Amino acid sequence: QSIINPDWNFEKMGIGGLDKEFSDIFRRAFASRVFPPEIVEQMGCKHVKGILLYGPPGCGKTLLARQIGKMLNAREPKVVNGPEILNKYVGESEANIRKLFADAEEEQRRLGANSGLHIIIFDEIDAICKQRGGSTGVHDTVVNQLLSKIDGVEQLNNILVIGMTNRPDLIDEALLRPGRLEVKMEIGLPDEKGRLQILHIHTARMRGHQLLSADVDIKELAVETKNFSGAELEGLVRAAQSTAMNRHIKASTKVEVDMEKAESLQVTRGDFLASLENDIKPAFGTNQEDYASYIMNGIIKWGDPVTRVLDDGELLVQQTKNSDRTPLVSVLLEGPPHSGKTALAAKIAEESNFPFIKICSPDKMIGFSETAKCQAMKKIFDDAYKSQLSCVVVDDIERLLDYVPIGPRFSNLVLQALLVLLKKAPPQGRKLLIIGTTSRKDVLQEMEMLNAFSTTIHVPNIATGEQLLEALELLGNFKDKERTTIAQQVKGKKVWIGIKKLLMLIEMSLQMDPEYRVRKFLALLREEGASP
Amino acid sequence: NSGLHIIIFDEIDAICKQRGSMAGSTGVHDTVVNQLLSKIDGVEQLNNILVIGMTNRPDLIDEALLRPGRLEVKMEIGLPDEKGRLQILHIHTARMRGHQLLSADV
Amino acid sequence: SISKQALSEIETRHSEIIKLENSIRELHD
Ligand SMILES: Nc1ncnc2c1ncn2[C@@H]1O[C@H](COP(=O)(O)OP(=O)(O)OP(=O)(O)O)[C@@H](O)[C@H]1O
Ligand SMILES: Nc1ncnc2c1ncn2[C@@H]1O[C@H](COP(=O)(O)OP(=O)(O)O)[C@@H](O)[C@H]1O
Ligand SMILES: [Mg+2]
Ligand SMILES: [Mg+2]
């Protein structure tokens, strides 16, 4: 008298992090299959016949389904590996769909209220069971042939279907109604305790044979890895093992010397800490490569107007991290061309210590049509809702809309997508922060895009001789005599020059012979002069 | 116990639901890529394959095809330099040398 | 639109029989 395996326990299941979801799934889908049959039959109830698991990809959805399958005293589970049923001839997909349920019907007709459970695991239910609408080809027929089997004129009572998908809203609505796939669970990214348990599960075996050094710690690794997804944790452990093993392929077995040195192999903290920086790069985490590409030549301090901007950025970050009545915040950086607004946004973003940071620039969308840009922006904004903190940077706003002064001309659709997105708070609890960057504030003011933003900041140019001299001194060019001559010539008047244009005039002037350098630099600076 | 079964693809970027984002329409109904993924790793496990992919347009490669457990080691084969050209010229000219067909002037 | 499906037809080969029975039965008799 048992429907479950006589011997089992959860601690052997190999799953770690998903505790409450498993408890709820058991309560719903297994409460009425483990009570004594007499009471259940007296009640006159019917068992649940569906489960739908959805969430971010790579967090252990397939594993839970396979382990629920290998759980029971049920026969071995069948599998429909996604698009394995499609065919070219007329009326062949339906044969494939109908072939699955044959054994269940046979047993139900042969026995009654006594047969053994049958489990069908359906991978990527989204691939085929799309909305039933125009024609879609084979989609409309397969969906009907499926909906007409789980609950039809004839009654089945010994079946249970599991459906896995990462996008939940593209499944036909009818399918997801009480009576067919009913209980739907979400598996998300794990927090600290989940990472601790996963690392223990994946390191126990090494620990068993003493192969693990005493220097390594697991709590520190759990703390330092944030927004890692399980698969990435396994990858990290494998990378550590491979690095440790390769540490010996050049010392002991390379020279074919006594393996005792090779047999003293032991993975240590060095392997992990040197493998956390050059092998694994999360998909929902900070990526320390772009910031080294945007702030090309550092952030020098040419005067006051840098400190104020940085302080304001810090204040905005601090506000967005510790407030409950204001989850969504925004800010706009603006100024004249060639002033530095993509090298002061990156710094503010990178000095926040948020677990998620992303930059969406127009440089990686050359040739795209409008809908491609819309779906790129929406995809980047989808991720930030799946982490408990974030910062998304929108760079060069005026090149996204495809602006051009003649006309004027621009893309309406991108503007509407942007205006709707700048006023959408994330699901309950989470936070956000958005930074912009533009050079034509007024044209933005015309389109009514300064109502969405909650503040603005101003980045100025070099506007006095002293600041130019300080910038030249810090950059490290020209000598004492040349410095003195430049100071005496340029002190009287005033200058108005950006800070990404000075780095070009310096180079253009540093290409003549030593005698004419200062003269050419002064001529170039004078010619490229103007006033507000 | 079975040994490796290495499979060499070619122009693997031809099948990817990423080239359709650009101006044009060729997504091969995207189902192609699905199938391939489900075979490398998935519900049913395999422990003898060394799929090697090679392509000329790295930017059109799908994103779901590079997570750990799947194709997960990238590499770049750059053009040769003086030494490489010298070596590759020597290799393709060893036959003639042995038979003294090649003149001494060259 | 790309989804194009197809129907099909079949043939047969056929063999010889009808009077071999008579010869076999006559031999046995
Ligand atoms: N205090 C500073 N503020 C801004 N940029 C600085 C500063 N000190 C040095 N830089 C250099 O200024 C350069 C600014 O380049 P960047 O492309 O961001 O210019 P920009 O004028 O903001 O650009 P865009 O015209 O595209 O809006 C960077 O290379 C950075 O190294
Ligand atoms: N909760 C978890 N605990 C331990 N390992 C996990 C967990 N979730 C996922 N993994 C690891 O991820 C790998 C693959 O997961 P997979 O079943 O492909 O998830 P999905 O199909 O949802 O992407 C497994 O080898 C497993 O070791
Ligand atoms: Mg810019
Ligand atoms: Mg899978």
The 3-class secondary structure across B53-99, one letter per residue, is CCCCCHHHCCCCCCCECECCCCCCCCCCCHHHHHHHHHHCCHHHHHC
Strands of A330-334's sheet in order across: A358-360, A392-394, A434-438, A330-334, A456-458
Task: Give the Cα separation of B51 and B41 in Å (integer).
Answer: 12
Ligand 1 pocket by Cβ (under 6 Å): A 295-300, 302, 306, 337-344, 439, 499-500
CB distance A89–C7 less than 8 Å?
Answer: yes
Technique used: cryo-EM
Residues 122-151 of A with CB under 8 A from C: 137-138
The one-character DSSP state at A389 is: S
Q: Is A384 within 8 Å of A392 (Cβ atoms)?
A: yes
Q: B1: part of which helix (H) or strand (E)?
A: none
Please report the DSSP string for A463-524 in residue order. -SHHHHHHHHHHHT-S-HHHHHHHHHHHSSS---B-SSSHHHHHHHHTTS-TTTHHHHHHHH
A281 is annotated as an active-site residue:
no
Best of A499, A502, A505, A507 for a ligand 1 pocket test (most atoms within 8 Å of beta carbon): A499
Angstrom CA distances, B64 to A60, A233, B18, B51, stand at: 16, 18, 11, 16
Query: Reduced to 3 states, what is the DSSP secondary structure of residue B48?
Result: coil
Enumerate the residues of chain A whose CB falls inside 8 A of the CB of residue B38: 81-82, 123
A200 among the known binding-site residues?
Answer: no
Task: Give the Cα separation of A250 and A472 in Å (integer).
Answer: 50
Query: Reduced to 3 states, what is the DSSP secondary structure of residue A444?
Result: helix
Structural gaps in chain A: residues followed by a C–N separation over 2.5 Å: 133
Task: Give the Cα separation of A327 and A388 in Å (integer).
Answer: 11
Task: Give the Cα separation of A373 and A258 in Å (integer).
Answer: 61
Task: Find, among B27, C3, B32, the residue nearest to A140 by Cα.
Answer: C3
Nearest CA in chain A to C8: A89
Resolution in Å, one decimal, please: 3.7
Closest in A58, A234, A369 to B23, CB measured: A369
Q: Around ion ligand 4, which residues have CB less than 5 A away?
A: A 62; B 42
**Smallest CA–CA separation between A68 and chain B, in Å?**
13
Task: Find, among A269, A340, A263, the residue nearest to A499 by Cα.
Answer: A340
Task: Find, among A403, A344, A378, the residue nearest to A331 by Cα.
Answer: A344
CB distance B22–A372 less than 8 Å?
Answer: yes
Task: Give the Cα separation of A397 and A337 in Å (integer).
Answer: 13
Token representation of residue A523: 């001529």
State the angle between helix axes of A139-150 and A93-100 in degrees (0 to 180), rounded to the nearest 10: 20
CB distance A368–B23 less than 8 Å?
Answer: yes
Task: Give the Cα separation of A231 and A234 in Å (integer).
Answer: 5
Task: Give the Cα separation of A51 and A184 in Å (integer).
Answer: 6
CA dihedral B79, B81, B83, B89 (to 10 degrees): 60
A190 among the known binding-site residues?
Answer: no
Token representation of residue C25: 């039965």
Amino acid residing at A323: S
Taking the CA atoms of A379, A380, A381 and A382 in sequence, report the sign of the dihedral they define: positive
Identify the residue whose tokens are 């301090």: A301
Distance of CA A99 to the CA centre of its chain: 39
Task: Give the Cα separation of B48 and B50 in Å (integer).
Answer: 7
Q: Which residues contact A320 (CB under 8 A, 6 or more apart)?
A: A326, A329, A431, A432, A433
Residues 1-29 of C with CB under 8 A from A: 3-8
Count of CB atoms within 10 A of residue A72's CB?
19
**Residue A204 in contact with ligand 2 by CB distance below 6 A:** no
Identify the residue whose tokens are 């520190």: A220
Strands of A159-165's sheet in order across: A78-80, A118-122, A159-165, A51-54, A183-186
State the angle between helix axes of A370-383 and A412-421 in degrees (0 to 180), rounded to the nearest 10: 10
Query: Reduced to 3 states, what is the DSSP secondary structure of residue A150?
Result: helix
A396 is annotated as an active-site residue:
yes
Q: Which residues contact A75 (CB under 8 A, 6 or more apart)?
A: A116, A117, A118, A119
Q: Is B13 within 8 Å of B60 (Cβ atoms)?
A: yes
Angstrom CA distances, A257 to A211, A246, A488, stand at: 21, 16, 73
Distance of CA B66 to the CA centre of its chain: 14
* Ligand showing the shortest atom-to-Cα distance for residue A501: 1
CB distance A137–C3 less than 8 Å?
Answer: yes
